[PDB]
Design a protein around this ligand. Sequence first.
Ligand SMILES: CCn1ncc(-c2nc3c(N4CCC(n5c(=O)[nH]c6ncccc65)CC4)ncnc3n2C)c1C
Length: 822
Amino acid sequence: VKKLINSQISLLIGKGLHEFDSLRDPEVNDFRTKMRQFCEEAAAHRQQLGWVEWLQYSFPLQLEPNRALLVNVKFEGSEESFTFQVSTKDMPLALMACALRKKATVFRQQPEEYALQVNGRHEYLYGNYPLCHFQYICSCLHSGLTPHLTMVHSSSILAMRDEQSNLWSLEQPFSIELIEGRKVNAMKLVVQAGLFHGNEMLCKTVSSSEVNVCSEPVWKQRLEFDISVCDLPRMARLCFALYAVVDCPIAWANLMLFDYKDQLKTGERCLYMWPSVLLNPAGTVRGNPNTESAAALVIYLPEVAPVYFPALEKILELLREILERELYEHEKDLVWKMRHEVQEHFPEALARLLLVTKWNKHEDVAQMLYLLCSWPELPVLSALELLDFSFPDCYVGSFAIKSLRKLTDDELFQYLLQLVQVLKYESYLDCELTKFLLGRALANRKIGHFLFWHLRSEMHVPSVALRFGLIMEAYCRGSTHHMKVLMKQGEALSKLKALNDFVKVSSQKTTKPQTKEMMHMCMRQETYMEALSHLQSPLDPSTLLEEVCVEQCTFMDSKMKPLWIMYSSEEAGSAGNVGIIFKNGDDLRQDMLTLQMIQLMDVLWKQEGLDLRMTPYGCLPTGDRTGLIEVVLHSDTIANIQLNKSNMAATAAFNKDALLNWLKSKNPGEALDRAIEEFTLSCAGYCVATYVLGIGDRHSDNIMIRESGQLFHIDFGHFLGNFRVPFILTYDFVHVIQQGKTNNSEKFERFRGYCERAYTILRRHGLLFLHLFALMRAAGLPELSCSKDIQYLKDSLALGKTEEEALKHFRVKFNEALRESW
Ligand SMILES: CCn1ncc(-c2nc3c(N4CCC(n5c(=O)[nH]c6ncccc65)CC4)ncnc3n2C)c1C
């Protein structure tokens, strides 16, 4: 029971709980206890919520960002069903009323006491929303399906809730002693060091002497820095970089001069260093957990008495506009001088002010903190900038979190990826971000679900394993029922990896149709049939992966042999037919980030009243170079369509005609003008999106098109011009945009109009894209590793330029892409 839950949580996080105890770090012991209570309390509150409020936790409504329609409905106990005529603008209650009246006429004798469960899905229909706003109904429109719903009474819903229950006086120049080592290299060895607050240095870099290349060296040098003990900030960081010289980095190590309880770090410290794959302030402040092979640096932090960092109470007592839109020294002085009026008249310039203050001056810092305490709540966009590595202070961070509490579950969900990456900056295990995320995660099952997998995937990384395992453990104490749902997924993912290795070996000896049959034999085995069937999709907790259709399952013949897994459900009909791509051996983190952005562009466009028919399909990294991808049904690649396949409905003489012929065959009659509008809008957005993000290697094999006419791109392994990518236009698309005519300038200017509208809309939001890409420098993706990668986004959107200049410059780029297009 208790051991079962503990051994289940270890099974789930992929790390033994005992490994946390064996450290004997009281910070860790303190984190597990504080959080467990926090998380446990959230579950207690959650058990007293009303059935409709419970549905908002467990079944978050999936909405869309005069005409009637057919709809099927039924009840829980009985299996008989009925159909109705209802408006797109009608409410769930209106639908539930006719459903109640039809049962009241068949049964022969209160809509507010029912909820419409989508059959064979983890979705419900309720609230003050017109039937059109629901994704499941909006889906039934384009597919022409019959919505099948179950009338679940308030009593039955509460039965599910029940069954799912669980100081300044020290004015000496700061110094430390450098004792001995235990490393390998061959020359002479040196040890640089330095103090930091964020990216900036608190003083100068003090190197040691050139001891010869050969040992477990001994220096025993008192390294005295160019800064006083009184001038050290609460979040002072001390780096170390060991290297050889006659140029060669060997290892790096960082640590906080203060502890988590605010006390200055005393005496003797052994630092287990990480390799290099010169000085790295961004890197984690905890030591390498591979104690055996990891080299080290033993040092002494001199004592000075039990000294603690001053409490708040103590600190509390201690041509202007022209430049406020980096800066000079005479300007830095002006900004700092005027600091009072920046609070009063320019509160949203806080981030700019914090950068001009001297963090190596406890007076400037006390006066800065003093102002910051009485600063007003900034916007969510401004708060995201305050979570940058440049703002390490806790008071700043705690205030940034204060301003992100207003995020909706959907706005939180949009930024969640970046919020998990900021935890990699965090100096102390317990923090407000962790407190926030975890609290929000326990308030919404979809946020908890998605946060979980964001943590769970990076467990194989040593720098975060401890941090993330602890947060996940906490979540499982708070979400005991969801933990089981998540295990079923883990077991499925566990099998998928085993099955995929088989398929990878098999393909090297045998052939594809044999491997395919061999693979299906493995799937039919007892453990695989139970493990891969019946589970909520990791890509979408509302989709249910029920019966795995083994005959339809396969893999693509491409290096990593990605598995193609297909599902079906009797209870859902066609809505229960869903496919997933399991990938292993490649990192999908970049693909998820490229997709997150495309989806954000669709939101910012949709918010300005512009729907460019984008297809931001699910992609979820779940483990070590492991993840799932969502199969977008009723779609095929341009290469598979351009084949110009023999005796198909799209037989064409030339390549240009292949595309449009495919659309005529999938959208006959009046349906084709809708499909070309769909194609034009989606193409505009994907032309703009791939241009802004710089997505190269765009061949017909990785560009797709839906049977509805919507264009979409796949395989986002290379972004930000890291194969300077130009704007791209293919003649085969221009031809379709032009309704299959060599000259339809009428349509072409509408198209060019969408590319111009879209492009400018994103420039107005250029800072959001920059603010979110700035927090991803924590993640460590090969192509999001420096300011030069952020410079691509600044340049592509042209933020330094005005609207007039950027649009004029973009029209030339658009024309240039049109000239190169044959
Ligand atoms: C990063 C990888 N990635 N990202 C998105 C995707 C991806 N591929 C597809 C797809 N495909 C592309 C591959 C096609 N295909 C083929 O031409 N030969 C095949 N053999 C076996 C299976 C599939 C085959 C079938 C249609 N159809 C629908 N959605 C998709 N998504 C999200 C992919 C594959």
